[PDB]
């Protein structure tokens, strides 16, 4: 009995607490949980960017965050349970019970990490690191593994924090082909630390429509602070879903081999600020954008870039309303550690992301286009100023990663 083909009655959730939410050719439910996840994405992204200086890059995987906190929700109760449901917009899947969310989440994960005879690799790993001394709830243990594949590995936080820390770090690294390293700095993890919950997500894809390295050239890129810098600009001409939306902003979709996952770029006209577009980027607008796209012939100028980012999510989430989970006095996670211990709370939550974009990904290729003549009045998309980037799974309308490229220069 595996969850990917299962019906809800085949998977008894038996959650300690339950919250009742108020008020195409894909699964209706996993599509709603998708709408939920994206709602969290743009709102969270809006906050994150507003707390950021305009000349800084931003990269993160909102799906990773939602998954990690959904894993945590499994043992949440009362108001900790409600805030989680509201903050992550799971409560917006009308009348559905908080327990149902996890079934849906598992269904969404099954599709996403298909592992079929595909061309792009999208992998995910989750895991629980509990102190060997503690005794975890049998149900929490079971469900975390059934719904999220998260296994529970015993570690010695009490005596060997440093050794435990290296074990975890080694694990994330391995599950991210080495792109996410020392997630846990030598400082954190002590003795008071009883549980380290972790989600990883890894993606690698090749362009369906090639950017020949031979065409890449240094070009000026215009930062928000009015100055310039030298970027490696990739170039090609060909058909791409595109659309010039409000106030001259250009939305472009670059698919990966398999067409299942794409890269979406949002480039405001030179006159307008990305901050202004960030502020107006509503979940419904973004969906509207994405749905109005149409195949077209254009010239593409896109820098090659590598972005590495990391930050604590605590403060951001608190502003959005996730307060109890972080308060040792208000936090209610009675479902996690078996036998009392009511005062378990999240001390901190960290996100670390990596993004590399270029030709061929990982030089040795070229492209020859013979006998082509395009309209001298073709649409051009020149990303030499700040723009937003998204990496999405189209059939599932899932935002896997998002960010902002304020500075691609070295």
């Amino acid at each position: 009995v595996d969850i990917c083909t299962a019906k809800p009655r085949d998977i008894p959730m038996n959650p300690m607490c339950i919250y009742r939410s108020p008020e195409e050719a894909t699964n209706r439910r996993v599509w709603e949980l998708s709408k939920a996840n994206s709602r969290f994405a743009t709102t969270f992204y809006q906050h994150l960017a507003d707390s950021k200086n305009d000349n800084d890059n931003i990269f993160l995987s909102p799906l990773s965050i939602s998954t990690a906190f959904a894993m945590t929700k499994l043992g949440a109760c009362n108001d900790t349970l409600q805030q989680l449901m509201e903050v992550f917009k799971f409560d917006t899947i009308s009348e559905k019970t908080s327990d149902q969310i996890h079934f849906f989440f598992a269904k969404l994960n099954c599709r996403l990490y298909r592992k079929a005879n595909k061309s792009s690799k999208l992998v995910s790993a989750n895991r629980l690191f509990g102190d060997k001394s503690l005794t975890f709830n049998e149900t929490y243990q079971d469900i975390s593994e059934l719904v999220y594949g998260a296994k529970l590995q015993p570690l010695d936080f009490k005596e060997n924090a440093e050794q435990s820390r290296a074990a975890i770090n080694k694990w994330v690294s391995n599950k991210t082909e080495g792109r996410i390293t020392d997630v846990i700095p030598s400082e954190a993890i002590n003795e008071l630390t009883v549980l380290v919950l972790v989600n990883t997500i890894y993606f690698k894809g090749l362009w369906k429509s090639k950017f020949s390295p031979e065409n890449t050239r240094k070009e000026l890129f215009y930062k928000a602070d009015g100055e310039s810098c030298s970027a490696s600009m990739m170039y090609q001409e060909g058909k791409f879903r595109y659309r010039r939306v409000a106030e001259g902003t250009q939305v472009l979709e670059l698919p990966f081999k398999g067409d299942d996952i794409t890269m979406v770029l949002i480039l405001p006209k030179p006159e307008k600020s990305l901050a202004k577009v960030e502020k107006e980027l509503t979940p419904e607008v973004l969906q509207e954008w994405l749905d109005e796209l149409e195949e077209m012939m254009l010239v593409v100028h896109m820098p090659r870039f590598r972005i590495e980012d990391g930050f604590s999510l605590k403060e951001q989430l608190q502003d959005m309303g996730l307060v109890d989970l972080f308060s040792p006095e208000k936090s209610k996670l009675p479902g996690i550690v078996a036998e009392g211990r009511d005062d378990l709370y999240v001390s901190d939550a960290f996100h670390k992301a990596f993004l590399e974009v270029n030709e061929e990904g990982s030089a040795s290729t070229a492209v020859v286009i013979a006998g082509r003549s395009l309209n001298p009045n073709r649409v051009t998309f020149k990303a030499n100023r700040p723009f937003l980037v998204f990496i999405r799974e189209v059939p599932l309308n899932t935002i896997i990663f998002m960010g902002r490229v304020a500075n691609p220069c070295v």
């Binding site: 990269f59 993160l60 995987s61 990773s64 965050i65 998954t67 990690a68 906190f69 994330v172 991210t176 082909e177 792109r179 996410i180 997630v183 972790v198 989600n199 990883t200 997500i201 890894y202 993606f203 690698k204 894809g205 990966f256 890269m263 999510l313 939550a349 960290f350 996100h351 670390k352 992301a353 990596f354 993004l355 590399e356 974009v357 990904g361 990982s362 990496i391 896997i400 990663f401």
Partner: peptide, 7 residues
């Protein structure tokens, strides 16, 4: 593109 994250 190559991307990874951990939370």
């Amino acid at each position: 593109s190559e991307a990874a994250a951990s939370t």
